[PDB]
Amino acid sequence: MTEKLNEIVVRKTKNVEDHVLDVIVLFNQGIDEVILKGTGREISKAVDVYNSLKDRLGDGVQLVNVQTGSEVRDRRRISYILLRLKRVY
Amino acid sequence: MTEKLNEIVVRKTKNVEDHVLDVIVLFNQGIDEVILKGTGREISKAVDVYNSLKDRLGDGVQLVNVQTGSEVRDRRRISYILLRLKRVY
């Protein structure tokens, strides 16, 4: 099961609120922890989602961890972000 | 003075190695700690610079902290990343 360990990747095709919407829904099933991964353009999409999700309550949201590294995507090097999060309420 | 507290903003007009070149030079002056900031497009040039700067040694490089939030830029909201780093050698 995945009650508190939902790892997900963000996209540049989907808007930001689409992931903030799918996130608040997941945190309804007990998903307190979540991981957004993004690349080149999707990289910033993960940010807004969390920023807008932080702007949601800040208290019912916690930043447990975040990391950043680059990898190959389409026979080319690109930057990527690993954004983690935790809910306290 | 600033021997270990160089906060700098990354840009999308230069290049990734342009900021990796200016960084390796700053470290040479004793700048072990550094903070890269970027927005929407530059938010990606900051991660690359570090990822590539890590490809340099890993040991002589350390990730002290990293954060991500959204802010206003040109009467519009944009995503931004705060990337910190520490040199151990």
UniProtKB/Swiss-Prot annotation, chains A, B:
Source species, domain of life: Archaea
InterPro entries found in the cross-reference section: Alba-like_dom_sf, DNA/RNA-bd_Alba, DNA/RNA-bd_Alba-like
Lineage, highest ranks first: Archaea, Thermoproteota, Thermoprotei, Sulfolobales, Sulfolobaceae
Binding partners and assembly: Forms homodimers and homotetramers. Homodimer at pH below 6.0. Forms homotetramers and higher order homooligomers at near the growth temperature of 80 degrees Celsius and pH 7.0. Interacts with Alba 1; heterodimers lack cooperative DNA-binding behavior and result in more compact chromatin structures compared to Alba 1 homodimers.
Listed name of the protein: DNA/RNA-binding protein Alba 2
Gene Ontology CC terms: chromosome; cytoplasm
UniProt modified residues of type N6-acetyllysine: K12
Gene3D superfamilies reported in the protein's UniProt record: Alba-like domain
Task of the protein: Binds single-stranded DNA, RNA and double-stranded DNA. Involved in DNA compaction.
Molecular function GO terms recorded: double-stranded DNA binding; RNA binding
